[PDB]
Design a protein around this ligand. Structure first.
Ligand SMILES: *[C@@H]1O[C@H](CO[C@@H]2O[C@@H](C)[C@@H](O)[C@@H](O)[C@@H]2O)[C@@H](O[C@@H]2O[C@H](CO)[C@@H](O[C@@H]3O[C@H](CO)[C@@H](O)[C@H](O)[C@@H]3O)[C@H](O)[C@H]2NC(C)=O)[C@H](O)[C@H]1NC(C)=O
Ligand SMILES: *[C@@H]1O[C@H](CO)[C@@H](O)[C@H](O)[C@H]1NC(C)=O
Lengths: 425, 97
């Protein structure tokens, strides 16, 4: 881990079967009985709208905040399910609480909002707010892992950063002595939506205002760039059905015209919409054939950069194999969905790769290979008589990455998730 | 039609013209309206749960004070004016370009 973490005043991590503070100060952590840890990555913590769903960090007296001038920052990742219920409009709820006797700091949420609040011993408070809309085709934020960083310079400003970019700031120099709490309560507090929850990961507390570079480094390090991710930002996994999104035209979905070597897959649109009256209106995500990633070439279930895999394709609740005949005329090799026992010597091995971008590693590429391991090419699409058929093409492999030409071969994998609330088809 | 309770129909398929009818206060669970032509049909104070409307056309057809839950509208002609004071919860709308 990098130096800023090593010197953090709090470093909350799951290790050797316990949630502990790895900071020099080794603060005590109390865990309530209804806190859920993700079995695949136990640093991912789920808190429900229940009294016993809580984590309490009892801080060492030394690092308890009680100052007029000491700068400090916090960072963490959060994944917030879509808001569904109108009771959630105008209902601000605390999630991370270091307030005592009406002074200190807190992280709270509201409909389409992440809120940072400071309050001094004179009852003077200041709020800094990140806003995201639920009326949007495809959101970067709704139900997707977000990296939050909040910094406080006592002489001037408090800043909120989202995924490493500055989003809001407000002057705080009118605030006097801030006397924060002896402990930090991670818990849903004041939430009127019975079914609300959050996921959180990698909470840290720093005793300085973090600068832009430190924030960028923190974002990149904690992104886990060796491991591929799904659309939501979770680890990409084997044996899990994913709807597909192509980054060149996110308004299409994958369809199969017929199964077998004479058939083809293609991109078909528009995606259409999913909505709740006055609450959200988004592009529908649960459309078209699903891909299942299959092990070929680690005992765990996580898909890593450069893993060689097979891809099954689910058409009317049956599994087929993604494949092509590389002997077909032309650079663009049209893909088919084959009966699995029928695949024979067809080209089907896929090298999973991430697009080398900033942030979470969830823009994925799939390099098709023949049975001798020779590249046939990244999977994208090509127009044949106005039909956008899926293809493997080595033309893609010849392009500069970050050139717009590679959008055609960039995908996201979307599994059915509790925080999305669309009917799967 | 699949009448199952006092207030509901369930697990039915309609694929024929529906004409000159008013339906009030009913719930419809897992109803499939497939290739239906609605003509002067009003649904009023009704609930549609996990229904599918697919390849439907409609003339002088209204849903008044209806709630739609987990319902799919796939290639319908259901513009906003088909609905009066109606509510949608987790509903999907698909249409060919
Ligand atoms: C709109 O959709 C949301 C989200 O629900 C998810 O998507 C739906 C379309 C369905 O496919 C669901 O299966 C899927 O979870 C609905 O909110 C959710 O309601 C369900 C109850 O139907 C809640 O389930 C509860 O789960 C808790 C544990 O967390 C159990 O203790 C309960 O016994 C119960 O099973 C679920 O928590 C809730 N999710 C959220 C984020 O609120 C919503 O009901 C739906 N709207 C309407 C009007 O139907
Ligand atoms: C709609 O129906 C509900 C009950 O189903 C009723 O309470 C309400 O008054 C109705 N609204 C109108 C405008 O008729």
């Amino acid at each position: 881990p990098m130096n800023i973490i090593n010197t953090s005043i709090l470093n909350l991590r799951y290790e050797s079967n316990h949630l502990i503070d790895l900071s020099r100060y080794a603060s005590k952590i109390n865990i309530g009985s209804k806190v859920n840890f993700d079995p695949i990555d136990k640093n991912q913590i789920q808190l429900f709208n229940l009294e016993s769903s809580k984590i309490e960090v009892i801080l060492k007296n030394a690092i308890v905040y009680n100052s007029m001038y000491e700068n400090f920052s916090t960072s963490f990742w959060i994944r917030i399910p879509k808001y569904f219920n109108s009771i959630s409009l105008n209902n601000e709820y605390t999630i991370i609480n270091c307030m005592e006797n009406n002074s200190g700091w807190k992280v709270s949420l509201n409909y389409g909002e992440i809120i940072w609040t400071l309050q001094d011993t004179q009852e003077i408070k200041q709020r800094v707010v990140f806003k995201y809309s639920q009326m949007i085709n495809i959101s970067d934020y709704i139900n997707r892992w977000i990296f939050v960083t909040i910094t406080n310079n006592r002489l001037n400003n408090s800043k909120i950063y989202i995924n490493g970019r500055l989003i809001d700031q407000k002057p705080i120099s009118n605030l006097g002595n801030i006397h924060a709490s002896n402990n930090i309560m991670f818990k849903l507090d004041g939430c009127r939506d019975t079914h609300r929850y959050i996921w959180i990961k990698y909470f840290n507390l720093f005793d300085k205002e973090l600068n832009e570079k430190e924030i960028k480094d923190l974002y990149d390090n904690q992104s886990n760039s060796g491991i591929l991710k799904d659309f939501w930002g979770d680890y990409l996994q084997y044996d899990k059905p994913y709807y597909m999104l192509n980054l060149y035209d996110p308004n299409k979905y994958v369809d199969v015209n017929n199964v077998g070597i004479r058939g083809y897959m293609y991109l078909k649109g528009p995606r259409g919409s999913v909505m709740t009256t006055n609450i959200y209106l988004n592009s529908s995500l649960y459309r078209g054939a699903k891909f299942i990633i299959k092990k070929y070439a680690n005992k765990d279930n996580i898909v890593r950069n450069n893993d060689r895999v097979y891809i099954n394709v689910v058409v009317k609740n049956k599994e087929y194999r993604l494949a092509t005949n590389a002997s077909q005329a032309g650079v663009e090799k049209i893909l088919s969905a084959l009966e699995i026992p029928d695949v024979g010597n067809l080209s089907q091995v896929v090298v999973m790769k991430s697009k080398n971008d900033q942030g979470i590693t969830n823009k994925c590429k799939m390099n098709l290979q023949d049975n001798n391991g020779n590249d046939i090419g990244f999977i994208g699409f090509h127009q044949f008589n106005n039909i956008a058929k899926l293809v493997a093409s080595n033309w893609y492999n010849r392009q500069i990455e970050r050139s717009s030409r590679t959008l055609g071969c960039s995908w996201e994998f979307i599994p059915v998730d509790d925080g999305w609330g669309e009917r799967p088809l | 039609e699949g009448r199952v309770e006092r207030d509901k129909y369930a697990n039915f398929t309609i694929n024929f013209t529906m004409e000159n009818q008013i339906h009030t206060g009913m719930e419809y669970d897992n109803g499939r309206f497939i290739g239906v032509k609605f003509k002067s049909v009003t649904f009023k104070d009704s609930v549609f749960k996990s229904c599918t409307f697919e390849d439907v056309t409609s003339v002088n057809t209204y849903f008044k004070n209806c709630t739609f839950i987990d319902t799919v509208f796939d290639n319908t002609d259901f513009e906003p004016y088909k609905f009066i004071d109606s509510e949608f919860k987790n509903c999907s709308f698909f249409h060919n370009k």
